[PDB]
Amino acid sequence: GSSGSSGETGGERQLSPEKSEIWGPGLKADVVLPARYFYIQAVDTSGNKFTSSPGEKVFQVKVSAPEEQFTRVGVQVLDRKDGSFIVRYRMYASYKNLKVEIKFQGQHVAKSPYILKGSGPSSG
């Protein structure tokens, strides 16, 4: 069997990933013990907040450690607010350093990946 789909649109602002800002308790020094979750705000080319509902599956998140490999991370994106989203993930293995990667249709949203290693001060 086989089928197809369709959908037209236009006029709306120009959703821009680069602009979109990614903030949360994840990109911090003292993160949560178990798992953390950050928010993803959709911004246009004019640096304006979409504060709207784009769709169900529009933004994705990748989780993988530079030292440890073969990490089956099942991240799920759910629309909590009428503009922002929540990113949750589960892991049953040692977590020393992870790499956050956010992309949109082949376009990086934030300054990813994100390398977070070394308790604050290191050089010293």
Omega cis (within 30) before 113: yes
Q: How many beta carbons lie within 10 A of that of residue 54, not counting itself?
A: 14
User: Residue 73 is which amino acid?
Assistant: V
How far is it, in rounded angstroms, from Cα 115 to Cα 98? Answer: 7
Determine if residue 106 is left, alpha or beta; phi over 0 gives left, psi from -120 to 50 gives alpha, anything else beta: left
Domain housing 60: 13-119
Is residue 5 included in any domain, yes or no? no
- 70 with 63: CB under 8 angstroms? no
- Counting the structural domains of the chain, the total is 1
Q: What is the CATH number of the domain that holds 76?
A: 2.60.40.10
The CA-CA-CA angle for residues 37, 84, 21, to 5°, reads 75
Is residue 7 included in any domain, yes or no? no
How is residue 73 written in tokens? 């991370």
Method: NMR
Residue located via tokens 């979109």: 20
Omega cis (within 30) before 34: no
Distances, alpha carbon 100 to alpha carbons 42, 53, 71, 120, in Å = 18, 24, 13, 18
